[PDB]
Amino acid sequence: PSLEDLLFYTIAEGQEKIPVHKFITALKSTGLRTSDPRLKECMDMLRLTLQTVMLDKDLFKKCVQSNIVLLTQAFRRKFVIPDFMSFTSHIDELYESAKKQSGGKVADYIPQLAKFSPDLWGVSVCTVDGQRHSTGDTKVPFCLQSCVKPLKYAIAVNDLGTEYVHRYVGKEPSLFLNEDDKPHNPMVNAGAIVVTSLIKQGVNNAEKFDYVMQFLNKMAGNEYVGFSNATFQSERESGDRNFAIGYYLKEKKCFPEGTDMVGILDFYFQLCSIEVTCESASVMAATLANGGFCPITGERVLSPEAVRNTLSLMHSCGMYDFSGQFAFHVGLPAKSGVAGGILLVVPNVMGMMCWSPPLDKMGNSVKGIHFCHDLVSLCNFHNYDNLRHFAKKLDPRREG
Template structure:
């Protein structure tokens, strides 16, 4: 039955808490998964869901009759909790971050925080793959071969495990309650790229596989990394960090992304490199300059303050407070 799994899942979420605390717990978890992107609650949707929920109430009573809920479950309170979960409001951007968190093994790619365990991600993606698209789930698994979750708002959250998360939104729905154009995009997506779960990743030539890097060398990676730092492009920094690149890698002159960002005054890139990537502030280029020296030379006062605070913190952690040379 459509929605029965979701209702049972709601009954298992922190059943020892009252309704308000259960909703607050879920909202905080969603917020973490969005990496701080937009997330809200739409009360009009909640009231509409509750007023037009005859079938969901019937499913709830059927599930209770078959003892699918924990003992002493209050069905009316449970249904309200379920309707609340149906009324959480996100944007395409925040939904894409949630999908990317699933694709990244439960680690939010924006904050780097581990939100979900690997087992929880695996189990959730398995459910999305088998029943995330309502009664169209079987055909979607056959044609697209990727875990996804749709909503009657016209949204689809698509996950390419270990690669990326995608959010689609187009309101016109098909008879199954899925976005017509969203389904079309997913079909064309896997027809062009080698992402279907059962695609042959070695011998198929008619599809592209962005995961395989044939021509990019380490030298071009360094150039792209430093070019991103020069332009203040945090997205490029994040992409290379997720690919596992050494963010302290320098060019021929020994200049790293932190050198370039400090010299150009890009505070957002500097913060990302020192806070998320934990790069060393002591790396010197061929002329003996550290990133702090570049920030001082080009009079980026804010960057100087940030780097000085970071160096002081590194020295404290290494037990060398007051020293001026690298630990």
Template sequence: SYCEQFITVIKNLVLSCLIISCFTCHSTLPFKSLGSARFFFFMYLKEVSYVIKYFFNLKQALRGTGLLTSDPRLKDCMQQIHQAVQESVGTAMMDQELFRKCVGSNIVLLTQAFQRKFIIPEFESFTSLINHLYYNAQAQKGGKVANYIPQLAKFSPDLWGVSLCTVDGQRHAIGDTNLPFCLQSCVMPLEYALAVHEAGTEQVHKYVGKEPSGLKFNKLYLDEEDKPHNPMVNAGAIVISSLLKPGSNKAEKFDFMMDYLKKMAGREYVAFSNATFQSEKETGDRNYAIGYYLKEKKCFPSGADMMAALDFYFQLCSIEVTCESGSVMAATLANGGICPITGEQVLSAEAVRNTLSLMHSCGMYDFSGQFAFHVGLPAKSGVSGAVLLVVPNIMGVMCWSPALDRVGNSIRGIHFCQELVSLFNFHNYDNLRHFVKKLDPRRQTGHERVRPQTTFLISHNANKVKLKDKNMCPDSTMDTEELKSMEALESLV
């Protein structure tokens, strides 16, 4: 079919462009895209052309790699393809210049994708296992929807969604992943990370501690230094809200935080629920009590307005995301503060390290110790039913199901996280060398584990192209013995 032809050809094209570039340039750029694209377009396609509307059906080809056609990094490529389809008449064919124009700006990303060089190379196999975990968790019953905030009580306990985003921007979602819900306490690590990024660790921890409290998240209780125990409980988050953008008015603070969260989410869905905000204010007696207690103990920085800090805290808890946008936020933390789908540095490495440390020890209310023991990953839960999970250097996950257990964590979210580390070696203390009973999705299978240099041997249809003549790659430093070794690998292709 045309679609199968497209998948085969585009994989070979982008793979070949990268290989030839290794031997044709030594510049700081990975390849000379114009020359490589032209060379392989004619080498592989020669007189063969494809109908534009079929050749440019990228969606199916990208799905297996984990990339979405809506990925911001592919914006230019997708626009060029759309324009080519719109301008084509009948069976208009693609030529070399059109090909170069469409994929040239994204050749590196496409090469990584089709060479399976992303953090999770076998993405389709991985996501099929994720789906299995999702359905297992869906079978978990019981729990109650939070009802002390009226707006939260309106959600069905049967809602359940899981979305993930890797540090390379691979995406997967299953279930109710496009329904907006409020971050609630899941905003606490994001708020803290921004405070550390802006003011520094030392300044922030003058006002808030680093220890788990062992108490319910909304207790009127401080540590021995008369500071909130950590930024992941209500008292700590209220104090942190007073440290953000000091000297600014309420509107400026809110806009500042919203812009930051949108950067974290790669400009995906981030909104504000005014109804939840009003509901929080009307039913927030406990938080007002905490605020006055903090004021009595002089926990706020000099000149801070306690009521303004509470208002800002209520606003932050009322910010809406979806599982999809929330997973990108988690992936930004997993990626050292760099948003995977935009490449923007949102947070400093110091802010991310501190945030993940506190999420690991304090992020799951008074279930934090159990979660750290069994799951061993940084996470933060919220009474909306959200669980923001970070697998450092691999991916971020957002789970959401409004049915909560007795301590306020999502029943399905907890079950999913536990099953995830039971299947994959994601626990912080899984031994990667000797713990062979778990799966490592970062590994390639079969002949794909062979070093990238072995891709000298490229197959297109039934014809093999062997780059054995060093005249084809005059800048190569490989000696005769290495070339012989490459020839010996032909049987693997």
């Protein structure tokens, strides 16, 4: 009748004792990792009883009681994708298939970007329940670049609301400005720079940057977030483009009262030069997918308003000149950047990061784009893809 007992019997298979490796394996095949923040108590307990292999009903109950709800959900098959092994097999195929696509040029406008190999290709999945999978180069760091644009937009809306933010920037797809003399949307450079000015006003750059990093940490569930000073230096050295825009926004009175624009550009470049991995960035995406809750910590990180707005803008303006085409064919909110990241959200299902340095003339990762098309081909995930009556296509949220 006890929860721990019920779970014990199901895992036990009628034996009297569960070998520790039998439970770990079973757990792993739900897609959870053993380093999941929410499973810390259980793993700490296992570490304890290991200092003294076989777990009886009472010893097991002692290890798992703190995390029984989550563990049951996993073992009952209540996660958003129940057959995660099958799903990861499919992800592996899509990865392999995109790997073959050798087209594209690596971004060479600064050394740091130009230094990355064309053969680097990673894909990471984090489910809204925290199920995690990776193939390829998922642990290498690289800079978010423009991929940071939704995240800081999220932050601004989180902190200030829709109304205040949208006083300063628009919300529709397109250096030039909209009808009302706002930049068109936070997904372009002009709008991003305006969004940059909004965040934590009245404290210095160092402080502001620390705030954004803490927030990024929560979104990633305390996985890898870093900073590239080198990238930062080269960006500031060579951003005549963004200097143009700043002076223009200044002239046109685009910033909030008492903005030091040159200082905001400096912040803006530091923001571009933040580093993630596939793995960490997928958690961030999963946060967006999960409604502002981090799927691995369980923390509320972003308001429902922040997340909805962000996904809306990722939809229509997220992939530079390919936005509209991407919305039509792929139908997922996403954002890319010049180091080859695409950050992809499949609302209520998962967050994804894809990384490959060579880009197409639109500015997007070749393999990343190829991968996203393939995903949507295979899976009902398109925004306007019916839940009942897909045509020929898989639904991973259905047992099979």
